[PDB]
């Protein structure tokens, strides 16, 4: 669990800064900032860590397409390109299909026009699938993952007041779900140790956004997790920090966060 070899990511269009879907209409995206942002975390992911990065390109028409995450969803060597809720974002599925097919994945495409899912929605702890129903992913949606990945146990949570399931948790380790303090996120988390039989530990942060991290297991490095950074969020770096059984890794995304982007939203991993 937690593996990885190669990372597909995708650049940012010049659109996203006042194109692309959000939730809110806060502070303004500051689209060089943006950029910046993103090359710190590709450059973390390849040269620090080691992976093979497929970098893809923008594509000015679809102003979410840095987003990769909720085109597609891996295990072992299968890979499901999903149908994404968000009908501007559909076409971003082709350019992702082509790169997994190029890294040899076995390719289950969601054809079904009655099923949506973001990969986004779906939390993958290495022993199970958890799948939040949305407004980007329906229960059709979370049958195909289902059908997809039989191996898998697949239980659905309710997203509530989030884009994502996982714009309020993610995986810091190997039995380690990072979750926010929120009264939905803990109804999501209660739901999800109620469907499964396993036991999970949980690392509380007081800031929803802030249970997004990227965990990887790294030769040569061990467990590591990119978190959000002290500046962005005080309160739940400090959880992050105190953790000396990983190589911590503050990642700024802020500028992404504006439109509800976290950070593993920005990639696709693959252990090959
Ligand atoms: N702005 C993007 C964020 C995906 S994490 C969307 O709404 O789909």
Redesign the pocket.
Same mark, same amino acid.
């Given at each position: 669990f937690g593996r990885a070899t190669h990372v597909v990511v995708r650049a940012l269009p010049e659109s996203l800064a006042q194109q692309? +879907? @959000? @939730?809110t209409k806060g502070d303004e995206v500051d689209f060089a900032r943006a950029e910046r942002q993103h090359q710190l975390y590709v450059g973390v992911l390849g040269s620090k860590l080691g992976l093979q990065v497929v970098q893809l390109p923008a594509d000015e028409s679809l102003? #979410?397409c840095v987003?990769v995450? #909720?085109v597609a969803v891996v295990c072992e060597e299968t890979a499901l390109i999903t149908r994404? /809720?968000?009908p501007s @974002?559909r076409k971003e599925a082709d350019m992702m299909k082509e790169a997994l097919e190029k890294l040899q994945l076995n390719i289950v495409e969601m054809k079904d026009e009655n099923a949506t899912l973001?990969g /986004?929605d779906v939390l993958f702890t290495g022993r199970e699938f958890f799948v939040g129903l949305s407004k @980007?992913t329906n229960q059709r949606g979370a049958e195909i993952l289902a059908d997809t990945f039989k191996d898998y146990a697949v239980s659905t949570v309710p997203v509530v007041d989030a +884009?994502?399931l996982k714009?309020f948790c993610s995986m810091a380790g190997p039995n380690l779900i990072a979750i926010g303090s929120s009264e939905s996120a803990q109804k999501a988390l209660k739901i999800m140790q109620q469907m499964s039989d396993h036991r999970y530990d949980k690392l509380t942060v007081p800031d929803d956004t802030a249970a997004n991290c990227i965990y990887l297991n790294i030769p040569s490095k061990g467990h590591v997790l990119l978190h959000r950074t002290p500046e962005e969020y005080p309160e739940s770096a400090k959880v992050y920090e105190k953790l000396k059984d990983h190589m911590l890794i503050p990642v700024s995304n802020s500028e %992404?966060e504006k439109? #509800? /982007? %976290?950070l593993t939203?920005s990639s696709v991993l693959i252990n090959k």
């Amino acid at each position: 669990f937690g593996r990885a070899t190669h990372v597909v990511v995708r650049a940012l269009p010049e659109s996203l800064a006042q194109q692309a +879907l @959000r @939730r809110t209409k806060g502070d303004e995206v500051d689209f060089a900032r943006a950029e910046r942002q993103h090359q710190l975390y590709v450059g973390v992911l390849g040269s620090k860590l080691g992976l093979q990065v497929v970098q893809l390109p923008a594509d000015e028409s679809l102003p #979410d397409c840095v987003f990769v995450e #909720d085109v597609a969803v891996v295990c072992e060597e299968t890979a499901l390109i999903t149908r994404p /809720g968000a009908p501007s @974002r559909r076409k971003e599925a082709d350019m992702m299909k082509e790169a997994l097919e190029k890294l040899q994945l076995n390719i289950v495409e969601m054809k079904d026009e009655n099923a949506t899912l973001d990969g /986004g929605d779906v939390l993958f702890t290495g022993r199970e699938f958890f799948v939040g129903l949305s407004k @980007r992913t329906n229960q059709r949606g979370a049958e195909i993952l289902a059908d997809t990945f039989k191996d898998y146990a697949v239980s659905t949570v309710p997203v509530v007041d989030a +884009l994502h399931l996982k714009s309020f948790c993610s995986m810091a380790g190997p039995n380690l779900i990072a979750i926010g303090s929120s009264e939905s996120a803990q109804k999501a988390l209660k739901i999800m140790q109620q469907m499964s039989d396993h036991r999970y530990d949980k690392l509380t942060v007081p800031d929803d956004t802030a249970a997004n991290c990227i965990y990887l297991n790294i030769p040569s490095k061990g467990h590591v997790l990119l978190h959000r950074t002290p500046e962005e969020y005080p309160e739940s770096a400090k959880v992050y920090e105190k953790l000396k059984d990983h190589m911590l890794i503050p990642v700024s995304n802020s500028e %992404l966060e504006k439109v #509800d /982007g %976290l950070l593993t939203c920005s990639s696709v991993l693959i252990n090959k």
